[PDB]
Each structure stands twice: as C-alpha cells, then as structure tokens.
C-alpha cells in the first residue's frame, strides 16, 4: 500500500522512465511516423525569394 | 549495509531497503535431493525457473483487532502458477522455500510482527476433542487467521515461538522479514495435497498503533519455492 | 569507456542471487545516470551469443540518406508579360535543411553536425512532347550576388561552381563540402546573428550553406512548360554532437522552432501521445 | 571505395566508425 | 527518458509524465499498465527508445523500465512491477500478473 | 558517501549534505582552450579566481502552479561580478560552468525537479510564426518562466529531455543537483552578448505537494563559470 | 534386427515388434537451443521428464471410406499433461517430436499408411477464396480428417509427399511408423497457441481391405515432445 | 554424408552376381528411405565416366532468375475528376511473391527460403509521342505510412530508400536484403499472425518484404498516358530448406493455398495426371 | 565478381555451393 502520515500528501507520484540495454538493436530504417507535413512550412517560400 | 537486499529467483526479483537480514533456517540452505538420500527411483523434473521464483500471495489487512495469519506450505502454493501445476501432476515434491514477508508503514506507526515459520504445525481446535478437519487446516491460497495465537493454536506458547526460524518486522526498524527454509521433512519427498511441512505464521505481538490518519497497512507475503523436485508424474487432480 | 561495438552485446547466464548489500535493481535517477542494472542482475538469464549488428544505427548510416530539401515547379515560357514575383525561368534558393520535415527532424536530433552535403538535383518537366532542356545550377555563397534574369551575366560563372545538366541525363550530383566557419553546423543556435538587436533569432548564417541559383540554359520556347526541380541532399562524412529530444509537435516555420501542435492527441500541445481511457486501461488487449 | 577525385570530402560515406561511448550519456556522472 | 503512462484525458501537459498513486482501502489493486509497443503509439512512443525506433522497423534487445518515486520521505510503500510476456490479456489482478 | 559534496571554486564554496552526485556533462570536465584548438591569436586573460567562482542567482518561488524556470548561460551572468565585467570588456569568452541548483523542503513535502542543462536551446514562440525577439530570449539575471515546459518551449519533448546533461532534485531523496558543463560550442570562443550556449532548465515534473503548513520553498541557483578565457579587449558595452 | 524397437522417453516407453526403422527427420535429431542460436535471454525451463515423454492421442478408426487424418503439432498437445501446462504458462517453446504411429491388423488385412510429417502445412480450403479459419486449422487433440488428401488439402500432390519425413505402415510388413522430428522453424522458438510447425499426416494410400470378419482397426498416435524448452513465463491462458 | 558433388557420379562396371543373402534390389519403402539399389547392383553395367555437371540444378541457379512479381498499367493524366479507387499517378504494392504463379510455384517448392531480392523495376509507357517520365519507387516497410497523393509529402524520402529512375534509362535495379525477422522466409506459415483469432491464416508478415510505393515524379501532362510498371524480383544468395510437393492444382488466391483444380484432367482435383484408357494402355505407342 | 558496394548482400549470386547431402532425404533413417 502507499502509506503516508497526516502531513504528507496522500497522492504521491511516480515518474516512469524507459531506456534500452546494451542488448538493444535496430535495423530496417524507415521514415518516422511521428512527424508529418501537410503543406509547405511558413517562410519556406521566402527561402526562395 | 545489510539493510538492502535483492533476492533474484527465476524471472522474479524482490528488492527491499529496510531489511534486517535473511534467516537461512536452521543454518540450512535448500538443495536438491542427493543420490544417497534419494528414494524415488524415477528422474525428477526440476524446472528451476518455472517454480523457483516468488509467488506473491494475497495481502492481508494488518489491523488493530487482528489476531494473526498463517499460511501452510505448500498448501498456499498448490494452485498457483507452475508450482501448482507441478504439484497437481506429480505424486512427490521436494522444495525449500524463501519466504519474504512485506509489511511497511510510516515512521509514525508502531507494531511488531513475529514472522515465524513453524515446521509441522499440527493445529488444535479450542474447547473440543474433535480434531480439526480438512477445511480447518487446508485453507489454500487465502491462509487462515489465528484463533488463539498466544498459544499458537496448538496449546504451545507464542513466547517460545522464536525457537523456530523467525524474523521480526518491527515497523520502527525494518519492513521485510526473509526466512530461507530448507526441506523439513522426515521423508525426503512427500505428497503435497495431504501434508504441509512448513507453516508460515505471522503474529501481532505488538499491534498496529498510531495517532495519524489511519491508512490501510497490509501484510504481503511472497513465498518462493527453492530447489524444486517432482517425482511420480500422472494426470492432474486439483 | 570508449570501445568498438560492432554487434549487440552478449547475455551471460546467471543463477539464483540472494545477497545483502548488493542491490543492482535499486539505482538513483537523481544522479542523472541511466540505471546500470544488467538483465543478468535483475532476472535469471541464459547464455545468449547476440550476433545482432548495430551498424544500421550508425549516425553515418542514420543521416546519409538523400532526402528532399527543395522543390519548385516553375513556369518555363515567355516572361515578358508575367508579374515580377514568379520565377522568370530561374530560382534562387538559400540552401536550407529546414524546408522539409523528415530530414529536418533527423538533423534536429543533434545540436552540432559536421557533414558534407551530397546535393543531387533532380529536374523533371511537364507540359502546360517533352524537351531536353539544359539546366545550370550555379552555387552562390550566402548573401553574394544572385542573378536577376535568366540571361543575365551573373550566370557566366567566373568562380561560382556551376553545374550544367540536362533533363535526359542522370540527375546532377555534386558534393558541397563542410562549409561552416565553425567546427560544426549549429543546428540550433541559441543566440542572434547580428550585433544589433534586429537580428533573426536562431538563424546562424554559418549554419547556412549558401544559395543554389538554378536556371534553364535554353531560351524560351513557343509553348510553356512547368519545370519542377527537386533537390536532394545527402549528408555524408558525418560527425554529430549532443543529441536532443526529437520534435513531437508539427513544425510551423523554417526560420524557428515555433510550435502549435495538433488540435487533438496525438502530437498535440496538451497531449503529445494519444489518449486512452484510464491509466489502468490497456488499449490493444488480447481478448479471447 | 572508388574516389577518383582530388578531394577527401568528395569520397563515399564513411560507414565504418563503430567506436561508441554510451557511458558519456548513460553514466555521465563523475 | 520519461514514459507518458498517464496518457489519459484530464491529464493536461505535464500531468501525463507522472502517475498519481494514492492510499487504497482495497487489497492488491492495479495502479497502471503500460502498452509496450515501441513501434506503435502509446506511452513508449515519445521516449528516446521510442522516437529513434520509429525511424526503424525491426528491433531487438532488452528494455529497461525505471520508476522514480516522488512522494515524501515519510511516505512508505511497496509496489510490484510485472512484465507479462504476451499471448493473453493484460493481467488485472496481481495473482495473475506476478506469475 | 556521495551524499556530501563540497565544491571549492575561488573564494566561493558550497557544501551540500543531500546530494545525489555531480554530473560532468557528456563526460567532459571544463578546460582552457588548447593551442591546437585556439583561434584568437592574442593572449587571453584568465583571471582564475575573479570569475571561477559561484555566482548565486536570484531564488525563484517553487509553487503549485509553477510551470518552470530557465536561465540562459552566460546571459544570466553577463552583468554579475567580475564575470560580467570581463564579458562587457571582451569580445570573446570560453568558459565551462558548474551549475549547483539548491532546492530543499521538509521530509513531508514531495516534488521532483528536472534540473537539465540544454545546449543551444533555440526557443520557439507558441501559436505564431514570429520568432522570439531579444526580450523573449535574453532575460538576463532574472531568467524566464517556461510557457509550455511539457514541450520545452521548442516543440520538442520534456519526456526526452534527459538526453541532455541533467540531474533530478527529488525532495524525497536529495536537495541539490550539480551539473558540471564544459564549453559547448562549435566555435572555440564566442560573443557573449548575442549568443548563449547552455540553458539551465528547471522543470516541475512532479509539483510541490504537502499537507503541512505551506512554507515558501524557493529554488536557488548558483552557477560558477569554470576555466574562463577572455580575448579581444575593448571598452565596456553593457 | 531392426524390427524390434523400444523407445524410452521419460516415464513413458513404447516397444514395437514389427517396426521398419525410425526416421530421424532430415537427418536431424532434436536438441536444446544452443547459445549461439538463442534469442530469448531468460533461462528456459527444461523439465526433461514431465514433457519429454509419449503423450498418446485418441485413436482414429481406420475404415474403408476414410480419407485421412492430420494432427498439427504442438496443437495436438497444447492441452495434454505437463506439455500442455508448460504451453499455457509460457510464451515460447522449442521442442522436437518423436511421433510413433501405431496401427496393426491381422496377416489377412491389407493396407498402406503414409505416415508423413509435413513441416508448415498451410492448408487450403476447397472451391472458395476464403482462408481456413481458426476452427478449420486448430482442431486440437482430436485432429482433423483430410478433405482431399490426394492433393494434401493445399493443392500440392500426395504423390510427392514422400519428400517430407515419412514412413509407411504397410500392414503386410510392419505395424508402426516412427518419425523423430527436430525443431523445424525459421525462428528458434515460437508461440505455440497460434503456430504449428510440424503436421503429422496419415493417409490411406491403399485402403483397409480384407475378406475376414471386419474387426475395428484403429490408428493410435503417440507423439512425444523432445528436448523441450520454455521461455517467457506468465499466467495460463487455455 | 555431406560431400561436394560437381558432376554426376560415374558408373563402375559390374559382372554376373549370384549371391545369397545380399539382395540389393530388395529394399524397404516402409522405412521411408529411398532405395539404395545402385545400377551396378541391379543390372550389369560398363565403366562410364560421367562428366555431366549438376551445376544448373543448384538452388541458387534454380531460383536466381528474375521473374515477374508485379504489373500495373495505371493511367497518367488529370485525376481531379477520376474516382477514388484508381491509381492517381501512384500505386502502393505490398511486395509479394504470390501474385504470379511461375515464381510462386518455384518458391513454394521449399518451406523456408533465405534470399536477397534483386528488384528490377521495368517501367513502360503507352499513349491513350512518348514522354521521358521520371519515376520514384519509394520502398516503404510493412504497414508503415504509404502516401495518399502523387505530390504528397511522404515522397520526400527522409529515410525510406527511394529509387528515382526514368523510362528512357535502363531499368532500375536495387537489392532488397534478407529482411525477415526470422532466419528464413516462411513460405508456408502453418499458423496465425495475430494473438486474437481474427488473424489471416498463412500470411506471416515476417515473410512480407514491405511496400513498394511507385509514383511518377512528373506533373500531369495535357494528354493521358497508360504507364505500365513491371517489377522483376531475382532471389539471390539463396539458402533453401525442407522441399515440398510442387503445386499441381491451379492457384486460386495470393493469400492462401486454396485449390479448385481444373474441370478435367490434367491438373484436376480428382485426376491430376491426364487420363488414359486403361492401366495396360500405352498412349504414345510406336506402331509401325 | 565485381561488387563495388559496401554491403555483402549486394554482391552477385553465389552460384558455387556444390556441397550437397542427399542422404538426409534419400536415407533419412537412423
């Protein structure tokens, strides 16, 4: 259980980390789905002017 | 230095930061059955990671009016995981145990736990000549509450219960007792469904007391079988 | 400890560990160090000879993939009646990794990059038969004199490295060297370029490669063509320093790291990762 | 591999530097 | 790198990085479960192991989850963190998960 | 053993009794500019005690609704002491930093500080295409409050901010983070009044929470420049 | 000399007096997963007698109008004994098999059994474009009857099915085929509940014919897993 | 006994054999072994030095012949009025050996294959003069984000291995490596991909190479063209395991091994080999 | 034969492996 006294906050927190180990490996490179591009970015037309 | 303790068994592992020590019961560490002590002639299955790991029992609410809790081994574990399936499929077993009882509270709570592992705890019923039946002894995963823990429910004394392998969870000092039990039977192996060698006993010698906001303080028990053998394969019973 | 690592590391077998004092699962995040708990030290492992090569995660192999950096469809016709804003058969382009977000997010993983640009200029043509046009791609440095016409006398290329290429040829590939005055390209420049307070924030001109002035060498033909010039940059001979959080929010501009985020999760401002019902709710649950 | 040019930057990509030091990131402490 | 285990609604911004655990009156309750798909959207996505692996398709090797408790020094508690290998449902009781 | 730490720089010194460790950023300790890396030909002034010392910034009130705090280096120190006068009188500087962030509370408070030192923190403004001006970036000794620290005010992620040199001030465990920063620039030296290499960033990942009497908990920052060089002497600017 | 054969695995044992030989499939005897081929890092449980033994399946009635029988491995054994409990409790398994198919009749009966063990028998449904579902493939302990064994239910040929590890039970010559299967998968271990590597296939190439009193002639199958490993312990699924 | 066999084996001479106990023609099929009766042991032979090389039956030479795997004629025109089902100047293709039956039956001779795909993309064009179109063939992995338009910003190829090629050029040939997560491609996958029971039977995505998203880089031209893109895969560096019966019945689908057979023999369900009159009737009889 | 690439899979087809073992098929018995 989480057991706090009367002067601590009853709702404590947990920060969850993740790393990888030395066993870890990656292959078959692809482009990231974390980013997209619907139109041209702003001032990208001004890089040509 | 001895307050921190990590117990790596199988895929399970338990760290604890307020530990006293870990009691190797009667100075004896668990081992497999040697050939000169062996009786069953067939080759025992020794899974070594499917059973030799911490099976965490259900927590019990450590309260003011609590009398105690007891789990009989391997009766607490005869239906849990791959230890339970090896129990149901085999006539014999030989396994030590690594009991790690977890119970913590704040630095404002007080209390003392007699975490004591009783070998061959033949219980007695109170104020009757009828022996305790099957339901009174073989509680299973739930365990049983002591009726009169001051006499350990067999007419003996709680005051002398420290002759058994025991540790104390004093909520002032530590928060985890650890008792490493060997194979304690006159026979080398035994039938698990009708006999229990060790009985973990957890007793409120000093009750839970504080003056702060009454959070639930439970007692969690994590019993790991050690050096499991299993002879006599058949169908399951459950 | 710097060591040569060609394959991923092996896993040693381990046994039952019951030891006081040594708590390898217990570690301190507050030191800032990532936890050194080996898988042997946490659970009970077998001997695994891991032969998985780590070579595709090399930063050279990570960034040396020729990604798009410029793209202009521009009309190729008589420009005697067109307005004085469109490309009159030429376009200047300040060479800029920031225009397209796949290469931009990869190069903005790091703070400092030292690479050689392998510029491949793919020119493709559509009719408003296809002509075999010859194109000049004059490399002008940052801020130098860029041409004003198609047939202006800046294209004579007395010293600027022009590359003359055709549409029917394979795409023109040149190698722009490491052209920063510093020892690495400042991908992020926390500071200002000018000494006065009018300077643009974040834009180090040392990070800027230069201009890529691209014209069509042929004269105007009686029918108009839409010529699309795609420029592909392959960073190579790459040294990379100080990696950063990858950008989660969508880009707003090429000049800065402004952020708005999506309207809803995923990749929103208030919620980067897509929402679920509760913290104890598993979204992709194996229900049989 | 081939590199018939007079400039060392003009060569192919050097995809051979397998020296890594994660301990300046995973264990940056003193 | 921090997981967004609290990837819910009403956790706005930075409340997604921490998991609020409380004192409980019931025994052996589930606090959180974490989707382990690095390659898909979930709490591992916006991590250093997640964002770099979404530049890839095939991945191997062991992960490493570290949980930093941020209660008071007087706050005492114990947790179990069960990695269940796949095949079945996400375990909702502790007796199911500690196997 | 590593909880106590005394950092003696110049006439300044800082002891701390609940420290985690001290992070030598990217495994790199600050040094003077070597001759093979040197660019400016004139002899740099190296005062070695007038600047290589802890300049303690103004404390900031760590509260419930706080989003964060950031100080850009050396912009936090370009007007403080003999580091500030060497900044104003010289065109170039090369200095590592030893940031020691102080923030303590009781054993009943909770909270977590991501004390993270971001190299080249190009900030972004929210919901506009206009770049952040001079006043939005160069706050000086006061520092700036984060607007959206969950994305570190540049569209990136706070969740991956531990890729930078960072330590945590968990008020449960420690009360002081210490990050020892080397010279992090592509150039060997730079103009201090228009560029900032390191940006100390301090973020409430777990907010300040307690149930006791709400004392003011501030966050005090003591940044010490290390191995200062200064080339290009002229008149002061300020 | 090679007509008698006793196969001792675990507590199980099978003698046979009219055997042809025993086919070590593709010249490969089963073994545990070596360290250079190993992928799962945790220590696999190797029970070595609880699973490495003959699990005798249900007999099937070898008749005149019979088309065939097929058992997919380990789908035939995922619910039987301690192999089934190790399957349900583990994510991975690596096990060879020792199939011993029993079928005898008198010296007046005739017939031929193509006891053939097909690796990766991707079945096909007849006269439809819909793939065979879960119920059409994963029959379990009962096995499945061939619909068109002349094409082995996948458009291939029965005539070339002797390219697989096979033996013949010609009721004239012998009465037991024995095929010793290694681990046949591209992966070193696999998930047993959604994949089957070997498919034992039993086909009446010559049907059961006689002129005497028609006794029931059944085909009994005794599949023994060999060199079992199991990684990835969890709760049971079934 | 593993031995190096470059030519077919010689035949030793033999003499009159009249021996008790040794019956080399008598063998046991019930053991499953193929009969070891040598031609010397059965009939009386001469000495023949057999110089016939076995090199063309090598599994490397058997399967390394670049066979067709994809073929789409798709319109190349204005797609502003076309329906939202046809190829709007691009097609995605999950790379799939199962689409064409000559390579499929050869690769389905084995159970497990370990090969490197040598993808040759032959693009050919017809008018509804011919243009010299430039094509992009972006290699997308299995299940990753495939583009939605011709000029969408997925084609910028930040990390996906695009190959840019023209119709007038020689055909674009790239080498897809061995891209299975297992040690061999499961040609037949007796099992299911998913953990739930909705998964498609037989389709292992580890056997799947990936997507081959192919667009035409040029803009739309005023006349429409029918561009046919043929993809040729050459397996190479081939290791092959567990051969199977060759498929006799015609294929029904690419997703599974369903069978219907021909209506009549040959290659029918009830009769694979074509019928004759009786078992003692010789069809091709030398009658003089 | 030629193989001016940096990847060993990118080479020509290895049509030289003449090692065969038919006795794992024609004589698969023990």
GROMACS .gro file of C-alpha atoms in nm, chain C residues 11 27 29-30 34-37 39 50 52 56-58 61-62 65 102 105-106 109 244-246 248 265-267 269-288, chain E residues 3-9 11-14 16 19 29-37 40-48 51-52 55-56 60-64 66-69 87-90:
model
   96
  298UNK     CA    1   2.400  -1.209  -2.238
  314UNK     CA    2   1.952   0.271  -0.870
  316UNK     CA    3   1.784   0.852  -1.117
  317UNK     CA    4   1.859   1.168  -0.917
  321UNK     CA    5   2.078   0.584  -1.655
  322UNK     CA    6   2.036   0.267  -1.448
  323UNK     CA    7   2.317   0.015  -1.491
  324UNK     CA    8   2.102  -0.284  -1.392
  326UNK     CA    9   1.945  -0.822  -1.726
  337UNK     CA   10   2.399  -1.197  -2.958
  339UNK     CA   11   2.278  -0.859  -3.400
  343UNK     CA   12   2.237   0.041  -3.924
  344UNK     CA   13   2.209   0.265  -3.617
  345UNK     CA   14   2.535   0.439  -3.706
  348UNK     CA   15   2.403   0.543  -4.183
  349UNK     CA   16   2.130   0.730  -3.995
  352UNK     CA   17   2.006   0.900  -4.692
  389UNK     CA   18   1.168   1.437  -4.247
  392UNK     CA   19   1.366   1.626  -3.762
  393UNK     CA   20   1.657   1.389  -3.826
  396UNK     CA   21   1.805   1.528  -3.334
  531UNK     CA   22   1.828   1.631  -2.841
  532UNK     CA   23   1.466   1.535  -2.788
  533UNK     CA   24   1.307   1.461  -3.125
  535UNK     CA   25   0.697   1.590  -3.139
  552UNK     CA   26  -0.384   1.399  -2.948
  553UNK     CA   27  -0.156   1.251  -3.086
  554UNK     CA   28   0.116   1.517  -3.123
  556UNK     CA   29   0.041   2.053  -2.722
  557UNK     CA   30  -0.152   1.946  -2.413
  558UNK     CA   31  -0.120   1.578  -2.510
  559UNK     CA   32   0.165   1.451  -2.728
  560UNK     CA   33   0.083   1.081  -2.700
  561UNK     CA   34  -0.271   0.977  -2.797
  562UNK     CA   35  -0.516   0.945  -2.512
  563UNK     CA   36  -0.669   0.635  -2.358
  564UNK     CA   37  -0.947   0.579  -2.107
  565UNK     CA   38  -0.752   0.536  -1.782
  566UNK     CA   39  -0.400   0.462  -1.664
  567UNK     CA   40  -0.515   0.105  -1.594
  568UNK     CA   41  -0.683   0.064  -1.936
  569UNK     CA   42  -0.492  -0.137  -2.195
  570UNK     CA   43  -0.584  -0.021  -2.548
  571UNK     CA   44  -0.462  -0.318  -2.753
  572UNK     CA   45  -0.571  -0.600  -2.525
  573UNK     CA   46  -0.564  -0.967  -2.629
  574UNK     CA   47  -0.925  -1.058  -2.551
  575UNK     CA   48  -1.015  -1.416  -2.644
  608UNK     CA   49   0.709   0.750  -2.024
  609UNK     CA   50   0.367   0.905  -2.060
  610UNK     CA   51   0.194   0.632  -1.865
  611UNK     CA   52  -0.076   0.884  -1.772
  612UNK     CA   53  -0.178   0.929  -2.137
  613UNK     CA   54  -0.540   1.000  -2.048
  614UNK     CA   55  -0.777   1.289  -2.075
  616UNK     CA   56  -0.406   1.500  -1.759
  617UNK     CA   57  -0.311   1.819  -1.942
  618UNK     CA   58   0.051   1.858  -2.042
  619UNK     CA   59   0.293   1.765  -1.767
  621UNK     CA   60   0.091   1.289  -1.833
  624UNK     CA   61   0.137   0.861  -1.231
  634UNK     CA   62  -0.522  -0.308  -0.666
  635UNK     CA   63  -0.400  -0.227  -1.016
  636UNK     CA   64  -0.236   0.114  -1.043
  637UNK     CA   65  -0.128   0.134  -1.406
  638UNK     CA   66  -0.049  -0.080  -1.706
  639UNK     CA   67   0.183   0.021  -1.989
  640UNK     CA   68   0.142  -0.063  -2.359
  641UNK     CA   69   0.479  -0.198  -2.465
  642UNK     CA   70   0.454  -0.125  -2.838
  645UNK     CA   71   0.316   0.196  -3.221
  646UNK     CA   72   0.150   0.487  -3.045
  647UNK     CA   73   0.149   0.458  -2.669
  648UNK     CA   74   0.349   0.562  -2.361
  649UNK     CA   75   0.676   0.439  -2.508
  650UNK     CA   76   0.640   0.647  -2.826
  651UNK     CA   77   0.766   0.983  -2.701
  652UNK     CA   78   1.079   0.834  -2.544
  653UNK     CA   79   1.438   0.811  -2.659
  656UNK     CA   80   1.131   0.807  -3.116
  657UNK     CA   81   1.455   0.659  -3.250
  660UNK     CA   82   1.294   0.553  -3.757
  661UNK     CA   83   1.327   0.175  -3.784
  665UNK     CA   84   1.565  -0.644  -3.081
  666UNK     CA   85   1.717  -0.646  -2.737
  667UNK     CA   86   1.603  -0.590  -2.382
  668UNK     CA   87   1.428  -0.283  -2.249
  669UNK     CA   88   1.477  -0.113  -1.914
  671UNK     CA   89   1.295   0.269  -1.427
  672UNK     CA   90   1.034   0.416  -1.192
  673UNK     CA   91   1.131   0.707  -0.967
  674UNK     CA   92   0.904   0.755  -0.667
  692UNK     CA   93  -0.019  -1.407  -2.563
  693UNK     CA   94  -0.301  -1.336  -2.322
  694UNK     CA   95  -0.493  -1.040  -2.190
  695UNK     CA   96  -0.346  -0.766  -1.977
   0.00000   0.00000   0.00000
